[PDB]
């Protein structure tokens, strides 16, 4: 994947303030910031890349930034990080996966819980919120993922 970076960054404050703006919340967050763990992946770029990761999002899951960028997040669905696309994981809920993968695709508020397994190969419950995410076009282009070890 030769995902490619924005230049100058990605304006996830920005982002945090326009996604407790929103309108029509299908899903209630409550207050975020840059503190907690989270992800912006580039809904135009091959696979959903992760384009941005906080700190909190590589401590909480043992990988860095050089390993956790341009990946699809599905990677930490498995305890070695190998995850092909369309594959029957052997851990993680196949429904789960899909609600996942539709909600994305629609551009639709989704929350689930996923089981996912941090750089060590240590497993646990991901309590995970998609929120997709206008950029300066007005267009959908980003999705911002919060993730909170249950
Ligand atoms: C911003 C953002 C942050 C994210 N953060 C995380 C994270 O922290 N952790 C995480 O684990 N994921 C995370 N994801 C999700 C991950 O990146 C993928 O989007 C997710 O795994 C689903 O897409 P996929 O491409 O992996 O689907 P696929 O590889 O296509 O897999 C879908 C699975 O569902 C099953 N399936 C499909 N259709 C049906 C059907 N009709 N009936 C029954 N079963 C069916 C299949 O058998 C398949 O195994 C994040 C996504 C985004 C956009």
Redesign the pocket.
């Given at each position: 994947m030769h995902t490619l970076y924005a230049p100058g960054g990605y304006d996830i404050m920005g982002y945090l303030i326009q996604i407790m703006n929103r309108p029509n919340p299908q899903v209630e967050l409550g207050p975020v910031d840059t503190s907690c763990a989270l992800?912006?992946?580039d809904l135009k770029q091959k696979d959903?890349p992760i384009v941005y990761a906080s700190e909190a999002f590589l401590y909480m899951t043992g990988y860095s930034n050089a390993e956790v960028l341009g990946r699809?997040?599905?990677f930490?669905?498995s305890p070695d990080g190998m995850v092909k696309?369309?594959?029957?994981?052997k851990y993680?809920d196949?429904?789960t996966?899909?609600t996942?993968?539709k909600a994305?695709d629609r551009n639709a508020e989704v929350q689930v819980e996923?089981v996912?397994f941090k750089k060590n190969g240590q497993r646990f419950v991901?309590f995970?919120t998609?929120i997709p995410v206008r950029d300066e076009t007005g267009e959908y282009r980003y999705?911002?993922?919060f993730?909170c070890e249950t």
């Open positions: 992800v912006l992946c959903t699809n997040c599905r930490l669905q696309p369309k594959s029957t994981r993680v196949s429904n996966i899909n996942m993968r994305i996923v996912n991901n995970l998609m999705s911002m993922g993730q």
